[PDB]
Design a protein around this ligand. Structure first.
Ligand SMILES: [Mg+2]
Ligand SMILES: [Mg+2]
Ligand SMILES: [Mg+2]
Ligand SMILES: [Mg+2]
Ligand SMILES: [Mg+2]
Ligand SMILES: [Mg+2]
Ligand SMILES: [Mg+2]
Ligand SMILES: [Mg+2]
Ligand SMILES: [Mg+2]
Ligand SMILES: [Mg+2]
Ligand SMILES: [Mg+2]
Ligand SMILES: [Mg+2]
Ligand SMILES: [Mg+2]
Ligand SMILES: [Mg+2]
Ligand SMILES: [Mg+2]
Ligand SMILES: [Mg+2]
Ligand SMILES: [Mg+2]
Ligand SMILES: [Mg+2]
Ligand SMILES: [Mg+2]
Ligand SMILES: [Mg+2]
Ligand SMILES: [Mg+2]
Ligand SMILES: [Mg+2]
Ligand SMILES: [Mg+2]
Ligand SMILES: [Mg+2]
Ligand SMILES: [Mg+2]
Ligand SMILES: [Mg+2]
Ligand SMILES: [Mg+2]
Ligand SMILES: [Mg+2]
Ligand SMILES: [Mg+2]
Ligand SMILES: [Mg+2]
Ligand SMILES: [Mg+2]
Ligand SMILES: [Mg+2]
Ligand SMILES: [Mg+2]
Ligand SMILES: [Mg+2]
Ligand SMILES: [Mg+2]
Ligand SMILES: [Mg+2]
Ligand SMILES: [Mg+2]
Ligand SMILES: [Mg+2]
Ligand SMILES: [Mg+2]
Ligand SMILES: [Mg+2]
Ligand SMILES: [Mg+2]
Ligand SMILES: [Mg+2]
Ligand SMILES: [Mg+2]
Ligand SMILES: [Mg+2]
Ligand SMILES: [Mg+2]
Ligand SMILES: [Mg+2]
Ligand SMILES: [Mg+2]
Ligand SMILES: [Mg+2]
Ligand SMILES: [Mg+2]
Ligand SMILES: [Mg+2]
Ligand SMILES: [Mg+2]
Ligand SMILES: [Mg+2]
Ligand SMILES: [Mg+2]
Ligand SMILES: [Mg+2]
Ligand SMILES: [Mg+2]
Ligand SMILES: [Mg+2]
Ligand SMILES: [Mg+2]
Ligand SMILES: [Mg+2]
Ligand SMILES: [Mg+2]
Ligand SMILES: [Mg+2]
Ligand SMILES: [Mg+2]
Ligand SMILES: [Mg+2]
Ligand SMILES: [Mg+2]
Ligand SMILES: [Mg+2]
Ligand SMILES: [Mg+2]
Ligand SMILES: [Mg+2]
Ligand SMILES: [Mg+2]
Ligand SMILES: [Mg+2]
Lengths: 117, 147, 141
RNA sequence: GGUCAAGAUAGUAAGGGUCCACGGUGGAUGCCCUGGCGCUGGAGCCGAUGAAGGACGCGAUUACCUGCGAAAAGCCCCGACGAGCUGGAGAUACGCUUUGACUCGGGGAUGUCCGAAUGGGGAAACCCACCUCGUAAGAGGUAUCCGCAAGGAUGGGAACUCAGGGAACUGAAACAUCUCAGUACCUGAAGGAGAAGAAAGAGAAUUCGAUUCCGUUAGUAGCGGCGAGCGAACCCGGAUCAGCCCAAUCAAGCCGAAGUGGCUGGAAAGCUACACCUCAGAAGGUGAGAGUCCUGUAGGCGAACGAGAGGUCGUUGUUCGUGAAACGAUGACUGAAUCCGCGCGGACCACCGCGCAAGGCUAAAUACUCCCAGUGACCGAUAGCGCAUAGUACCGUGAGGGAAAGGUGAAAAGAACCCCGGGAGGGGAGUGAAAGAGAACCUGAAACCGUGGACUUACAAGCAGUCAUGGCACCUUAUGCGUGUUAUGGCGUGCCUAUUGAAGCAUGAGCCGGCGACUUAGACCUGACGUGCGAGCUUAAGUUGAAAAACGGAGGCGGAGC
RNA sequence: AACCGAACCUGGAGAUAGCUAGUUCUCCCCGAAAUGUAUUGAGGUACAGCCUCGGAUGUUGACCAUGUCCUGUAGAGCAC
RNA sequence: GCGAGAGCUAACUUCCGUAGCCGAGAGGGAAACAACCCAGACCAUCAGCUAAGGUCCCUAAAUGAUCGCUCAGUGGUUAA
RNA sequence: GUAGGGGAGCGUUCAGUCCGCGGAGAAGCCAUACCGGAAGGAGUGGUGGAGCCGACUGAAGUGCGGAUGCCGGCAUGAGUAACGAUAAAAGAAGUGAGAAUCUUCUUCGCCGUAAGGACAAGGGUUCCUGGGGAAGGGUCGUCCGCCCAGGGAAAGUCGG
RNA sequence: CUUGACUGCGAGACUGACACGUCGAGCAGGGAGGAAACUCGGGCUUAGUGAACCGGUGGUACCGUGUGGAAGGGCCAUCG
């Protein structure tokens, strides 16, 4: 017996192509360039899962430093200050305190510069 | 049927290189690796054919869908009478039945029934049997197919 | 339809090619080379282009078929045959089927009970041990 | 509020982008068959009585095809069927037919011209004659070779057969003997087969008994730049049997069982309720899937015609390559015995065995497959034959090469008539179950071209992605883990191949769709897994049976090595 | 007969091609080599070396310490 | 890199020995960068500590402390 | 983790068997936010109009992006080059659904040992009449060497 | 003084991918020199070499195609 392709190739193809909507020009309409674009997309996805974990830490840190310095303290000195007084806060959380709740962040500042004295 | 003549020049043309249009990368060419007429018939070891057949009958015994039979009773070669005979023996119609006998007319009575398949003498075999639900053995052949 | 073959009876074959699963690109064959290529040939006794081992080795002696003797043991005839005796057409029906060759009897392991044997030849220690147990050995005329 | 001032931000899109909607293009995909493919089995020649193959004709209308041949889609008789017919062609008209048409079977009559062509010629299918009869019309004859005559031959035929002649690539990892291989090809002769055949044999048992074919012996014995590699036979088991004469029943055809009602549906075969035949439930057709509606099947009937010597030199054949080279086989030279004789048995001699050369025919088993029939874990429109038909169109001076091609609908009911337009095309209407089937007519993917809508883009450096967030929009696996779209930030050197090293200014690639590449074989070799038997295991050819399989021990493998 | 250091057509013929391209579905486990010698051999092949799977063994391997023997480089030295 | 020859104690040179890496290795660093430095990625996380390397702004992190040096943009490429 | 070895699977045709769907509508096609560790797999809806899914088992012409691969369709270059001798055109008039291109008139221009006339070879109805306008004509055509129909070719003396 | 520059062997190692190559105790026959223990199967050692194939020669009586012979091969030696 013989077994043509029948139906499989087009299903594969549409699969790729349908992953690829919103891609510019032929990248979203031609199979091969879709499939290709997608390989590179692979790289970018995996990488950036790790990397976004890298990025958000960064952000938190920025905000923290800011709040720190509003009340006359560097960030680094603020964080040894916190570790000294064994306050054990996430910097995600430290950021959110710093940004959202003024007086509270203030209190943590005073506690930390005390731990520094 | 494609002439073997070279179609055009090996280099030059700017085309890819080809020699013939009878080639499996060519629409309308040859199949690369097609099927040619062959055979599949080997010799399975005898003892295994025997043990098989045996084990067929055995399987259909724990059924218990064996029905050993002596003589029959179908008037003179009539299917309606096969139907009544069958019915007396619990053959409602809701099963597929293989019948093995050496009597011309009982077979000649079964056959045209949709749900009966009819086999003379030692035309028996694991396939045909295991194919069906019930087996009509008959029984005359059974005391000889032991010894 | 109920039935299934034995686990490990039938391995599905190698379909080389068919994607990066899988043996990608080169289907086992490696990269380039005469081994890579697709043609019937080398074959098997071809070393380098060199000068072959078999070609470097000394030939010894002619060739001769001669006669070969079909072996019958004592230990066979002995222990547990209970002497149905040897004759000519009896051995066959028991177990030493050949034809076209003459029969020989050889020492094997042990002798005890006496029997009458019909061969075409036998070893010294075999006739000696078959007589020393009371049995006679028959060579043809 | 007004003027001025400083600052910040918005909208408009010429065109683009992403997504959505709706189309066009195009012909993938699915379904299908009117066409192929293989295997098995059958059947096997035609021709001077004019073949195979053609040319020109024949029609109420005739370009193609089919059929035919101036007696021209046909004429005569016989047989069958029994109502339609007047070819594919579907189209108008003429008409034929129960005094038996049409079709089927079987014989005859006619059968132009060319083609072995054969009166002579010739650039095939055209030109020119001669003779006998005849009133003319017309008819018949006029080739060569064997033969006294009668009669035979010439030509054609895919494969198969034998014979005369006889390659190379290639393998030997170079090459010359060798191998490819007595293969390809050329020529010849012939048949449905042909060849071969009735032992101056094979052989080693004082065994066998015409030949061919299958298994096996056996990759054994041997051959060989003893390299590559080449490779028997005897025995044994089968298929089929045969040895005689000369020289002193199938081909037309007919008969042939059994069902209705309600329901869905455009339509009944499907559903459902009860019902029947079956030596018949194989199959196809019927508005969808029918044992019981039609054709059929099982079974039965069935025809006037129809069919069944030795030598020496030079060489070569089989495993036979100068080898110690027997034996056959001839080209050259030469040339014996005829029975107490002759020929062989692998140099050669004796002995022991087998044999009667120089004279012929022979069916059967075997090969093939143009043609016919049945079947298929063969193909269904790039597949399968090159062809759903065509060796056509087309290309070539020629030899020769050589395509694509498929689908309304159950049924033509093939859309009267109205609207715009010269028309093409379309919108209505009408038919239809559906024109979401209208003749550019099954489905109708993708590339590719457009219309419309959403959010968007005119300070911007970019492998076009990816991550994060904000804006807008949307709510049928959807109010969240959202879907679309976007702004801005972070991050980011296409794929493949080939490489020490690829974004590379290294290779390939316009795009999408289809076709497209590790397979088959042997009864080979060697391992892994599994199964059946197990000191044993197994059959092959074949025989019979065959909607299955069983027999078949010849052989092969273990059994002891050196 | 629009390309002649040997025309063209068909066939042998799927010539040969140690050469270049190409080689298609997914996940999981281990995971190399580009060294040696030999080759009318050098971009090819044979056998080792290295990888994997399976069956055997059963700590035999690894590192590091202790013991013991071998060495002629670094340095240095000038006795040849 | 270290050890040598060859070479001009030239070569992103050539040929050997030896370790490591690339090859077949992604991740951070060295602006960029197969090889160097840190380090071997089974998957998920808007979690914590560290390595090399870094903490003025682009750019995560001390415009840190104390004792000095250089004033030449030396820093941010060579010699007698 | 490259060559390579090993392991478990996904999907495709055909085949046997079982289940079973289908005009209250199959396969195929189309959309989709659901499912599975991946090949992949379902739900619903739109299309379509007659066949087909699932399960186990068997056999393969069984899975594509590459091969300057093969057949086919459609893009880019682009409304770009070009429209085939620089002998040359103008007006009126007619026709016609439509005219720069057709017909008539008047002129103009170009060949004139030719760009005129007659044979041969070759071609094969291309000639004449009447009609036509899809394509062929490098535009356009109402026209034509194109398409349809019907006519036309005459030998004792020319050539055989 | 002599022919150990010897036949029949070879425990066990070195060494090479293979084929090769190298060293060698000890047993037998049978010898040389020594008064003897003993030593000798070439040279202080490491180069002075050529695998197969086909063939020459001396021995050998293994095979020899109906049997007995002989051609021819085989074996050990050996030359090209
Ligand atoms: Mg981290
Ligand atoms: Mg075709
Ligand atoms: Mg694998
Ligand atoms: Mg690829
Ligand atoms: Mg490659
Ligand atoms: Mg606009
Ligand atoms: Mg005709
Ligand atoms: Mg007539
Ligand atoms: Mg009649
Ligand atoms: Mg009729
Ligand atoms: Mg004639
Ligand atoms: Mg040659
Ligand atoms: Mg060669
Ligand atoms: Mg002939
Ligand atoms: Mg001769
Ligand atoms: Mg010869
Ligand atoms: Mg002779
Ligand atoms: Mg199709
Ligand atoms: Mg109309
Ligand atoms: Mg738009
Ligand atoms: Mg600016
Ligand atoms: Mg802007
Ligand atoms: Mg390079
Ligand atoms: Mg590499
Ligand atoms: Mg580039
Ligand atoms: Mg490039
Ligand atoms: Mg290159
Ligand atoms: Mg290019
Ligand atoms: Mg086993
Ligand atoms: Mg020329
Ligand atoms: Mg080729
Ligand atoms: Mg060939
Ligand atoms: Mg690993
Ligand atoms: Mg290489
Ligand atoms: Mg190896
Ligand atoms: Mg140890
Ligand atoms: Mg020194
Ligand atoms: Mg270098
Ligand atoms: Mg790296
Ligand atoms: Mg890096
Ligand atoms: Mg960086
Ligand atoms: Mg570098
Ligand atoms: Mg540090
Ligand atoms: Mg900072
Ligand atoms: Mg891994
Ligand atoms: Mg099925
Ligand atoms: Mg199907
Ligand atoms: Mg492609
Ligand atoms: Mg090109
Ligand atoms: Mg193309
Ligand atoms: Mg323009
Ligand atoms: Mg331009
Ligand atoms: Mg321009
Ligand atoms: Mg222009
Ligand atoms: Mg012009
Ligand atoms: Mg002009
Ligand atoms: Mg008018
Ligand atoms: Mg003009
Ligand atoms: Mg006028
Ligand atoms: Mg003229
Ligand atoms: Mg004419
Ligand atoms: Mg035009
Ligand atoms: Mg008009
Ligand atoms: Mg005209
Ligand atoms: Mg006249
Ligand atoms: Mg040789
Ligand atoms: Mg000799
Ligand atoms: Mg001799």
């Amino acid at each position: 017996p013989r077994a043509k392709t029948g139906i499989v190739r087009r299903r594969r193809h549409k699969k790729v192509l349908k992953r690829a909507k919103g891609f510019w020009g032929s990248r979203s309409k031609q199979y091969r360039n879709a499939f290709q674009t997608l390989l590179n997309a692979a790289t970018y996805e995996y990488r950036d899962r790790r990397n976004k974990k890298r990025d958000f830490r960064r952000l938190w840190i920025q905000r923290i430093n800011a709040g720190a310095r509003l009340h006359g303290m560097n960030y680094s000195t603020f964080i040894n200050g916190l570790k000294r007084a064994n306050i054990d806060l996430n910097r995600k959380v430290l950021a959110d305190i710093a940004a959202r709740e003024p007086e509270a962040f203030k209190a943590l500042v005073d506690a930390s510069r005390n731990a520094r004295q | 049927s494609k002439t073997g003549r070279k179609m055009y020049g090996q280099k030059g043309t700017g085309n890819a290189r080809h020699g013939d249009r009878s080639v499996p990368t060519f629409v309308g060419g040859g199949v690369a690796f097609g099927p040619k007429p062959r055979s599949y018939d080997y010799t399975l070891p005898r003892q295994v054919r025997q043990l098989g057949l045996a084990m067929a009958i055995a399987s259909r015994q724990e059924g218990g869908k064996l029905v050993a039979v002596d003589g029959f009773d179908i008037a003179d070669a009539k299917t309606k009478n096969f139907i009544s005979w069958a019915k007396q023996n619990g053959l409602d119609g809701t099963e597929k039945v293989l019948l093995v006998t050496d009597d011309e007319n009982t077979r000649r009575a079964a056959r045209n029934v949709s749900w009966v398949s009819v086999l003379p003498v030692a035309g028996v075999n694991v396939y045909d049997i295991l194919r069906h639900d019930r087996l009509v053995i008959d029984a005359a052949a059974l005391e000889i197919v032991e010894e | 339809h109920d039935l299934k073959p034995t686990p490990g009876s039938r391995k599905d074959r190698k379909r080389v090619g068919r994607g990066p699963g899988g043996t990608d690109k080169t289907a086992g064959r490696g990269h380039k080379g005469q081994k890579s290529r697709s043609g019937a040939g080398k074959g098997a006794f071809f070393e380098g282009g060199r000068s072959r081992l078999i070609a470097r080795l000394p030939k010894r002696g002619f060739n001769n078929v001669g006669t070969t003797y079909e072996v019958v043991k004592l230990s066979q005839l002995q222990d547990l045959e209970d002497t149905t005796f040897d004759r000519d057409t009896l051995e066959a029906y028991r177990l030493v089927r050949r034809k076209n060759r003459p029969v020989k009897l050889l020492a094997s392991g042990e002798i005890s009970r006496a029997v009458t044997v019909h061969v075409d030849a036998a070893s010294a220690a075999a006739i000696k041990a078959v007589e020393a147990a009371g049995g006679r050995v028959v060579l043809p005329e």
